[PDB]
Amino acid sequence: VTRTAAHTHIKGLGLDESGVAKRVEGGFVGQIEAREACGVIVDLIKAKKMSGRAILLAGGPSTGKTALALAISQELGPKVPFCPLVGSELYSVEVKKTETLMENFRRAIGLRIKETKEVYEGEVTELTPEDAENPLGGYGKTISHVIVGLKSAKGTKTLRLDPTIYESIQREKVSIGDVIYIEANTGAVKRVGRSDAYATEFDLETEEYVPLPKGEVHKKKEIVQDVTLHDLDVANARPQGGQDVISMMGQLLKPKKTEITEKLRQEVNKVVAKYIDQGVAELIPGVLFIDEVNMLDIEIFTYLNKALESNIAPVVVLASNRGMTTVRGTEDVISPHGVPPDLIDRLLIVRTLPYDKDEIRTIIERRATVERLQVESSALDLLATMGTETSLRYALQLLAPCGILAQTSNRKEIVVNDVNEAKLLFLDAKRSTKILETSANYL
Amino acid sequence: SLIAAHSHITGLGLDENLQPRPTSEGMVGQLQARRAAGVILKMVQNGTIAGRAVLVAGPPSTGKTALAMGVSQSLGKDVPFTAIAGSEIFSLELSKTEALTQAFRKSIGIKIKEETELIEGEVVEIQIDRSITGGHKQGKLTIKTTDMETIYELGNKMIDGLTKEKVLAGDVISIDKASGKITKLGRSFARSRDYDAMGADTRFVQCPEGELQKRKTVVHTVSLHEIDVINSRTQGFLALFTGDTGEIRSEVRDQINTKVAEWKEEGKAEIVPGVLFIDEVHMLDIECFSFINRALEDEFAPIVMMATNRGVSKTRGTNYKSPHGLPLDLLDRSIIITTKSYNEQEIKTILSIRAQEEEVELSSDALDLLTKTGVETSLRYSSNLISVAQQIAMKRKNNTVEVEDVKRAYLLFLDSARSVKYVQENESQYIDDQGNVQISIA
Amino acid sequence: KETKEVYEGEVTELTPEDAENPLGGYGKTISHVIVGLKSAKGTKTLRLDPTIYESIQREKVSIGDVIYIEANTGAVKRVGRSDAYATEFDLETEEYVPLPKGEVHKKKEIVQDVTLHDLDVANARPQGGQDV
């Protein structure tokens, strides 16, 4: 019914009120100390006071680091922005990697503003233009002003327009008898559709039909809106939504990331500080998750060394599989987890332990219950032995072919013959490696 | 169309019990790999499982790409199958992660339901009011069948579609209201007043009967990447064809994910998954492997099929060697289907299937020598030699292809080992690796 | 392989014949335009569409030029001025082509050889957008 994909079983960190964790709750099994550390981190995050904090989720492969990051995001909520990332995603061909990292830093910080909108909406009853006395004078436009008549429900008003607002009106291609929506904040117009008071069974353009808008014209309504600071930086660097010629030409041109200067970010900070001082906007700091942080070179770590010192920079969590591994982009500097020792001092390493046999067994059982598979006890034990023998992920990813073989053999339960056939058909890494070492023609 | 190297596969050749026949649907042998590919096919057809990587491995000239195209033919209609190679990821305007994400979002599909009105009748009159400069276009249409006659108002796009495919009165046209199609089925009046300018000779059609407007419901398939380019900029439809989709932002992706979830919950749209096939996967970089590792674990992620013919070799972008050229963390997430080399009977059956497809008739002894040559050097060499033996036979003005023809073809065209033995004996003739050569005869 | 049924030749007259019962509020209600075409060994008078007059004034077609109207698409193509009607003896900049040969109504089969890459690069580029 519902599409499952990878660690969908996680519903949260599964902690208690005192700050402790139960063994099997919240979709997790084990890793009690890592769970409690991430709970203290998410409490620090909800405190909304510190900036430029960083932790590291260290450990081997297939150990639960990305699971812990997803659990943190689910414990945080939708209003707090979670910005997932991979280390390889910072290498863009349009713009330097430093600006991509700073754009992600600004993308993590959220904002929630209540906004007041001045709205003229209604049905266009009349629409007359007034020409100029010298239409080919070269200066000014071919019309002078335009009178338009809008009636909402239980109201009627006549509007006299300057040529720019009517230029937007005719760019949205209104006609007599259409329901329109003038936003006086930007001059943007939205054509709602034909009024349904007239006959609605004769058009040939699949037009929607809408009743009269309730209330008077010249409404003033309050909208709550959730935006990030990166949205403000992008919207000011590529200005669209105005009605001048720069905003009109900005829509049609090809978008391209540019190195946003520090002056724009400082001006956006001053404006958001004014919005906060007005009491209309609140600051919501969030997270940024660089999975596979070993993929970054030394230059991104050098820029992080300064970008964590900002007064607005969020809390950033990292993951790494490496042990004593040389840093990418350097020649002889060998460091733990592929992370240079300057960044390790700002970091707070959260270790993550490997699993046991029974923990693997209950993880496989929970994955079978998530995927709506029914498994007998003997096949579950055999899959647990296979997990401890080959790998955990090879045991988790073998449940689906046993399900396919089960519905092939007109059964729902997974017998031992099904997991034996799935062992035969699909190989793990080690058996395929032994096949590689015992072949001549580079199989 | 033309005939290609994998044209003989017309499916995968398995039963309802997922048991392969010895030779069915143009495929022979490879029983375990065929059964495993059928299992992965049924797992795709279920659709509730997402982001599972399947790695096909074996020696060259075995049928890994043949197995992949067999899965593609058995995949059915309206299911995406993005078949790229390893080197399309590297680009000058796209990042590697962005090109991979574009491939991933091409491979997954959305089936959208729409409501459509069908109008078909004779045209009584057309009145079109265009402005002085021709910009604003508005007017009325009066279409008619034998039971009732209705008048519609026209918009700009319908009138512009009316100007092309010029519609005189008394022309039976079909109007699709949603798609905006105009289909002149013919002319039904055949008026005596005929214009000497116009050269149309549209066929006479019967007057339509029944009601004028007919409601129908249609379904069409569009991938996630197409809607991403469409919503990315104003002229996204042109960038769908010219490929000028330069690094679409993440906000667009988040909003289209929420939107297609909303369309799923309304019953309007249905999300079907697909198979993303990479050929020569070892050509990728290590950062591509890390992004594949962290992008298989997403809700919208297809069943990635991965093919390599390489043993333990150096992984690109790194200084070490790894099995299949793939690092161990990607091999952890991937289940490996292995393939095995053929015997003389399977090679004979392959060559017989190839000759039966390629419209070439062979004798028994020519087939035996082709089987022996195929089991000697390579299967692809004999499969290529069928063509030149056919052409030599038609140059000798005989319908069949004889043993002498394939012997002349074997003498005429060289294979790998013979060309190696001819290079090694004449090392002064060709340019060496140090760039030293003797072009003079003496 | 394609066929083309075309009309071309020197123009003799262009009369926008007004309609009987000429509506109201609009002057010049054309019922049809009569264009008299002449060429070598043939001369034809034609009864065209009311709408092709907009192309006639769009391409600046007057008496003394050679035009090119097709049967199916219905578009003029002003090739130039005839050599005989070189009335501006002193200073003019019009192109002058000879009067075309054959009948005015010539229908011929034309072959076109084109690569698939030309089709791809013609489909990919914007084909007359008339936008900025």
Binding site: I176, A199 | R191 | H32, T51
Partner: peptide
């Protein structure tokens, strides 16, 4: 009852008219 038709404003533009018998073009 039956709803009225939308008001069709045809002032200020040329008219191309095609009917069953003969074709018209009222231009300015």
């Amino acid at each position: 009852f039956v709803k009225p038709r939308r008001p069709y404003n045809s002032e200020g533009m040329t008219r191309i008219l095609r009917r069953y018998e003969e074709d018209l073009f009222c231009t300015f």
